[PDB]
Structure 1
């Protein structure tokens, strides 16, 4: 039926017809997510005993490393974790350039003032997050260890500039007095002092807030989550992702000798014939696992309806439609042939399979595969002083068909 449909006809003549192609599917994929590499020291900015205040932070400008947001996301040690417009898990996939962390302690209830969007009175004087902020803000009522110095901004007139560092503490009320006179009647220190003792309530307790604003994408990109590294599943058609090189094949053991700076193995044309895994630094030979062509050998439709199936360049074990590996399976140089019986007798070629192997319909009737015979085996009797003279003749009328012309066809292009 496949032969009938691929020819768009209800009747097929005798011969080999290529119906569809064959390809071994990949069993699995191999990435095996990467190393420890250089880790981002978020623990230093989180577990800081000498936590700073909101007027002056511990400005930690962190650079090329892997920041495992999943580590801080699967653990509920901190009270609240927020990250701008990104789920923490995918935070390990889509990455950025560099990060900057500011750590501070605030007074309880006013945790919501610090926000890229909605405003707050504290954010109007202490620290305002950028309007286009994209980072990670972690806040928790630590208390105990950091509770027993801690003074917070209370005297300003403009919101702090997006991503700005201000530590001003000059005494003034707003602008009304022409001369402030140090501390006249109301011009106290802008850094108002508060009680950070355990007796304080939840809304008046030290709240550790750390912002983790990462710079947007530029020409380089260094602070990225887990990517790279591989493994080995040898002698199997698999998908592999080797350091960004993605492809399907068999990763056999190889005797190649890469120089200790090369990873890929593109040899001749532009195909990758070898690879280096960045875990054991060994060389793996990439090979197309298996493919070929399914060909149907059929002795016509009028004669019979039985067929044989030939797979072009695959082994007889690699073939798994209906029955394709049980009995009547013969491995010739031209591939694996099923549905045909091997006969030692050599006849004239009927259906050319290849490499000297042909197939035919013969006895009930079946499909036989044999080695074609070059012709009748004549014995040549050379002998000097001996000749052979014909004593009779035959008048033979043979036929010779020769095409002369084809159908004249015109096409109106428009």
Structure 2
């Protein structure tokens, strides 16, 4: 390549510049603060009692780190139904003020909780929007929400003057006039109560057992989002040319221990011209340095192809540790100019003919 750069088949004695050596990163590391503030979902999923279908429990959720993997792998739940958001990508997506609507219904009517779905309780008790961005989780609770004498504590809305709008909760208990005469609070002709009790029994078959059903609604409005996954982190390595993503601040380099004393509220530092120099890992809370990976040109020292054929190679401004066909070659010498391979260091001193630098130079004997 000396000949190729010179574009000649014969080369004169001297030292010539060539391509640039540069170290490459090995792997990647990511660090995020201690995953805490776990979002309180057990209080709504493992609550002792749930509300009626017509008076479903509505809860708001914000400022929490939600672990949806455990529910995703939860084998206790049977219905994990939703299409608006892919179930495995919840941890990636970030939202705010997730809504939880929980109740207990019959097993047969669990299908009624779906976008664009009708039925007996879908259009009367809890109606879903056609553009629903959420997910419904349902599971049998016959052993808990039923009585051997009959669970009569759960009621559902049966008769209504009109349907129910999506995301509407109507708990009004008023007599219904089914004819052309007022009821006046009398269960007379064309007069039926709007609420009817459930008849849950342990001996009831599949579809008649009480199922606990809760829908999660994800909304993302102009205010900043705050509810999403834990953002798993990797481990920490040192003294290696890598690339890093420290709490969103990303870049390449090599990291070492440092003795800087950050004031207790900073996260990183820089010297001049916007060049980051130190960081603080969000878990150990210690200060680490950053230096760029080594680079620099290479040069070839030759006595002239007329005289001999062997050469020497100089990596300038590079520590003699990340040396690597000429990875080993001959004995390697380290000088203030860089690292030299293919030459032998002596203790004599003569005139200078091929200047190398820092007060040293080379000649042909080897």
TM range (shorter): 0.7 to 0.9
Q: Are the structure 2 counterparts of residues 280 and 257 from structure 1 closer, same or farther at C-alpha, using a change threshold of 3 Å?
A: same
Unaligned runs of 5+ in 2: 148-152
| Deviation, structure 1 residue 261 | 0.6
SS at structure 1 position matched to 2:176: coil
Contact kept in structure 1, 2:329 and 2:342, CA below 8 Å: no
Pick closer, same or farther for the CA change 1:177–1:84 going to 2, 3 Å. farther
Distance change (3 Å), C-alpha of 1:113 and 1:174: farther
CA contact (8 A) 1:237 1:249 kept: yes
Q: Is the 8 A contact 2:14 2:304 kept in 1?
A: yes
- Do the aligned partners of residues 166 and 359 (structure 1) sit closer, same or farther apart at CA in structure 2, a change above 3 Å counting? farther
CA offset digits 1:103-143 (Å, max 9, x no partner)? 01111122222112455553222212222321232111122
Instruction: Point out the structure with max Rg over C-alpha.
Output: 1
Moved more, 248-257 or 290-299: 290-299
Length-normalised TM-score, structure 1: 0.77
Q: 1:285 to 1:33 in 2, by over 3 A?
A: closer
Between the aligned partners of 2:74 and 2:137, the Cα distance in structure 1 is 12
The reply to whether residue 186 of structure 1 matches residue 190 of structure 2 is yes
Asked if the contact 1:228/1:242 (under 8 Å) is kept, the reply is no
Q: Kindly provide the CA deviation profile for residues 317-368 of structure 1, in whole angstroms up to 9, marking residues without a partner as x.
A: 2223x1313532111111111122324444444444322233344xxxxxxx
Q: Take 1:269 and 1:71, find their aligned partners in 2: how far apart are those partners?
A: 46
Alpha-carbon deviation of 1:235?
2.4
Q: How many residues align?
A: 360
Over residues 377-402 of structure 1, what are the superposed CA-to-partner deviations in whole Å (9 max), with x where a residue is unaligned? xxxxxxxxxxxxxxxxxxxxxxxxxx
TM-align CA RMSD: 4.1
Pick closer, same or farther for the CA change 1:16–1:97 going to 2, 3 Å: farther
Does the CA-based 8 Å contact 2:32-2:246 persist in structure 1? no
Q: Do the aligned residues in 2 keep the contact of 1:155 with 1:174 (CA within 8 Å)?
A: no
> Is the 2:78–2:138 Cα contact (8 Å) retained in structure 1?
yes
CA contact (8 A) 2:253 2:291 kept: yes
Aligned equivalents of 1:141 and 1:86: distance in 2?
A: 24
Q: Judging changes above 3 Å, is the alpha-carbon distance between structure 1 residues 137 and 20 closer, same or farther for their aligned structure 2 residues? A: farther
Is the contact made by 2:82 and 2:136 (CA closer than 8 Å) also made in structure 1?
yes
- Pick closer, same or farther for the CA change 1:88–1:268 going to 2, 3 Å: same
Unaligned runs of 5+ in 1: 362-413
CA–CA separation in structure 2 for the residues paired with 1:65 and 1:23: 45
8 Å CA contact 1:139, 1:208 repeated in 2? yes
**Equivalents in 2 of 1:127, 1:351: separation in Å?**
89
Offset at 1:262? 0.5
Name the CA distance, whole Å, in 2 between partners of 1:7 and 1:128.
80
Match in the other structure for 2:113: 114
Deviation per residue, 1:249-296 (Å, 9 max, x gap): 222111111111101112222111111112222111112242323333
Task: Tell me if the contact between 2:10 and 2:305 (Cα under 8 Å) persists in the aligned partners.
Answer: yes
Counterpart Cα distance in 2 of 1:112 and 1:76? 19
Partners of 1:256 and 1:218 in 2: CA distance: 40
Verify the 8 A CA contact 1:151 1:191 in the aligned structure 2. yes
**8 A Cα contact 1:108 1:204, kept in partner:** yes
Q: Which digits, 9 at most, give the CA deviation of each residue in 1:24-57, with x for residues without a partner? A: 3333322256523111111111001111121112
Whether the 8 Å contact between 1:59 and 1:101 is mirrored in structure 2 is: yes
Contact 2:183 2:191 in 1 (8 A): no
Between the two structures, name the one with larger relative contact order (CA 8 Å, sep ≥ 6): 2
Conservation of the 8 A alpha-carbon contact between 2:259 and 2:287: yes
Structure 1 position 300, deviation (Å) = 5.0
The CA distance in 2 between the partners of 1:140 and 1:99, in whole Å, is 21
Q: Which residue of 2 aligns with 1:171?
A: 175
With over 3 angstroms needed to count, the CA separation of the structure-2 counterparts of 1:296 and 1:85, relative to structure 1, is farther
Question: Could you tell me the TM-score, scaled by structure 2's length?
Answer: 0.87
2:350 matched to 1:347? yes
| Aligned-residue offset at 1:63 | 0.7
